[PDB]
Amino acid sequence: GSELSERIESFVETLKRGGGPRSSEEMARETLGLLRQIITDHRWSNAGELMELIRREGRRMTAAQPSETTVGNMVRRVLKIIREEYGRLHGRQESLHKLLTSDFSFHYAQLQSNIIEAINELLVELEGTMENIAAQALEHIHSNEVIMTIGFSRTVEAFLKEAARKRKFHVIVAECAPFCQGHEMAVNLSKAGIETTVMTDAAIFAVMSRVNKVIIGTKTILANGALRAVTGTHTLALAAKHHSTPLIVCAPMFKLSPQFPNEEDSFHKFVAPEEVLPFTEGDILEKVSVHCPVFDYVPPELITLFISNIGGNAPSYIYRLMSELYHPDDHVL
Amino acid sequence: MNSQYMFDYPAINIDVRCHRLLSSVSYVAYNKFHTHDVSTYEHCEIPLEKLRLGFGRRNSLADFYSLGELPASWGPACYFSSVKPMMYTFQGMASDLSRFDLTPNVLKALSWPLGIPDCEIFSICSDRFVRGLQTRDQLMSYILRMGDSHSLDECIVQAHKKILQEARRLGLSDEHYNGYDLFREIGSLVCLRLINA
Amino acid sequence: MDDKELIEYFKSQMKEDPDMASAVAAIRTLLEFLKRDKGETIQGLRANLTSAIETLCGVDSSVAVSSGGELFLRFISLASLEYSDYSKCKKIMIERGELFLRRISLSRNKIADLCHTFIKDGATILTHAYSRVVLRVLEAAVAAKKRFSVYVTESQPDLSGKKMAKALCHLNVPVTVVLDAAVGYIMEKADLVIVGAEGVVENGGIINKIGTNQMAVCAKAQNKPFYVVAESFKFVRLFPLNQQDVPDKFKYKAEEHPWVDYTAPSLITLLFTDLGVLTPSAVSDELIKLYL
């Protein structure tokens, strides 16, 4: 009750004010733990009340920070898990087959235990996601290869550190200005023994002619295979497409969102202009419009491969993955 | 292809000792898409393993297999037929002769087309006879035993060809014998031979 | 049921409700044929339905009619797979057909409600010719209090583009009419292209009025998104390799003037169907899921 309410309020305020969990996996774990706490603590008779309350909590969580899709992704995953559990315990996708062939009020005592067990299994699968993704590094990196990365991605870092145990290759890291987080990635990879280069975004095209493949992370994967990545990733994808350089996205399955690129102006995250133009400029700040978008939209035609904890896939298959994770009625939430 | 789903499949059993007798066609549940196309005649499904599916509204059955094809559906059972429907004589004669059993010149006249005397065609052409699921097996077995082949479509083609040859021998016009109902044609030809002999 | 009354019912249902499309009228005629068939075997039922489909496609040379024919044959095949007894199978078929008709009658509004969110305020929409689904999506977008300017092509062989312009000015949407040859001139002023389709082929491409391929190629050259709004029952298992590979029964009778053309899936961004917003690669999957 009070503990649950204060935990929810703290989570919402942390999302609204930023900071909190740097790791996306940590954010997913905290979201799942909070959802489990709501399921255990909150009182509900039938599954319909659970749907309504989880939907309200997820709506509040995503309204706190719409650019943080992992929270909504986990909320929809929990809703799908609850729906599947109810269908298994009570009963026995839209398609041409279903179209040709063709009630949550009922109550069950053991449904809650099954829901918690499924959520715990999901958490266990989430725990080993990074190792599962990194275990595929040797199948995609050959000897004396050149890899291009932008910003700081922990999944890509684990990928490269696992590949470096048996192969020698070069990694080029482009800083993601203004938050030049690529410097930390470069120094980490150098500490791991990999030979690394640090450069600004302005050189992304210039050196792309000498890059064998591009390995990047993302914040979100849309239903059509599009990316909500850090800013400057669209230019990197365009430069890779110019040279037909394969672009690999190493992203866990919990970053898949059933949304579509129809949404406008809430996609990119806009922050204080101080990052781009300092406050000490003076009077010219009065008449100059300064905008600092954090995220970028990447169309699916610029992506070659998705590597996740379940293996490799093409963007054209992303829809099927989206069909296996979320019910079509939970996209609106 | 929707033209390949088959509700039942014709299993063909052929005895080496005598093709004209005891060679049978049964029907077994298939409920799956076949490898080839299917032709439907008198609620009977024939796999088109040796002939190809054809389209149009050509008058005669021979007009199709002369091109190496078979129509999808034709005959009395289908409401709209690729061939042009026609009638044949002596059907009532066959209906009355139905009660005659197999027990000189009459035996020679009625030996066609098997070469052994038969009275099953009279049961085929009788008015009490009703086409449906129960009569697929014996009808297809008669077609199989008449011709010399292991394929049902080839047997049908050979049966129509021999019908046309007998009609030419007896002097009837080709247009009257096109193949809308093969077994009514057999009954008419047999009755004509009987009254001749 | 005679062939003459079949054609009469088809034409009557086409004329009575001009809003309803040809494929829906064909499927309704086939279901009405199945309603009163006085038969006893499913084999003759399938043969009679196939012959009815051939004569109906003789009436209208549109791809959508044949799409509905194959879809309906698959529906009968699945229903027969469910039940062996003819009477129980037939009653299951009639109830399932009524439900199928109800569901396909309301596909247009689902496509509109799912596609109107891709239109932005102040956008410039290019469309090819008359298509009731595009009219419906634009009506829904206007009902969403959105302001946009629509361009349409006059569609020379039959000026259905002018009909589209009139039906759009009916609701006071700012629309303009350009020639078939002016399409390449207009692409740079438009923001996105939205077209319909008379048939959706296996690989995700579409069959549509003769001017669709030009717009697809021009939009690809100018990096503009190309959206296709189409119904589920327009999913033919066809695989055209080029423009010549399109069956001739759809090109003509509907110097040499074809009435349709084929657009490759690589020129299409998204497909808006009653199944949802799909990539072209999804469509093939659907067909593979339908035929076992």
Place this chain on the structure above:
Amino acid sequence: QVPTRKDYGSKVSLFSHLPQYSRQNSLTQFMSIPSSVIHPAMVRLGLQYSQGLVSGSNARCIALLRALQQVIQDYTTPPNEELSRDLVNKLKPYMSFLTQCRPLSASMHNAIKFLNKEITSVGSSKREEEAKSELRAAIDRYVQEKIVLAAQAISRFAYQKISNGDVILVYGCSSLVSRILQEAWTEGRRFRVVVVDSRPWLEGRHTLRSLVHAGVPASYLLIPAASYVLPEVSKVLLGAHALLANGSVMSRVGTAQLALVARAHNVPVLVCCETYKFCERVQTDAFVSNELDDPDDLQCKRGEHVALANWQNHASLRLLNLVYDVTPPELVDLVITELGMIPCSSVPVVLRVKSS
């Protein structure tokens, strides 16, 4: 145990992670006669693998399955052990030896997975003779349904896409392509075939002979001249060694190049493959996973002098004999399988419906 085959020559640095053997060198020279640790059928099969006596993917799969049937027939379970575990544990070193003789093809990998799954599913209480007979019958049924019926269905499908008077371009040797062409000609289609070949295997000649024996008019040329002949070509028919989960086609080297040149000339590219060669793995280039054949095969006698003779005397010289390449899905117009005519993007879909 079984010793490790020694790498021959110096490999390219980008391909240094792959093994590279010599055809003359054989593992059996260090193994006992009669063979004890390795079954004699395995030894013979590996000997003909390393020497190239069988080369086709279907042929390699069939030979492996027949040898495995022989091994299963000769097998006896040991006391206090189970069939489902002991048979797999015994088969693993045989697969290692076969991989040492020559890297396993995708069809071989899928067949090995199928047989391992079938053996693991053998009941604990099931008798030995019955289990062996069922394993042999399962292998026979797998061969039948995954090769013969699949080829018949693919030929029937491809007949619809062949018209009178068209020109079809084929590459290398593929039993499926030759069967399709022969049956299309037999059914009544009248056309001509253009055969493209490449060094050093020159396996396209095989197909050429088949065509000549079927009465089909044929033309022959090498791969570099393909761009000359594509103006008169109407369609391109290619066989696949494997189809990957992203839709890319893993095939003999030079297939992706032919697809690219065909795209430049605006001709469709058709790929025929059986669904049992579909692979779950993904691959973006020919460098990460490939096979390094014998470099000495690249030597050719042009005139009276062989330039590449004693090539290892030069320290900086390297000889690269790639076996496979990868065609991106965007260069393939249509895939012909026993399920029907599907695009490359539908390859994972099939992988989803074949599994369950």
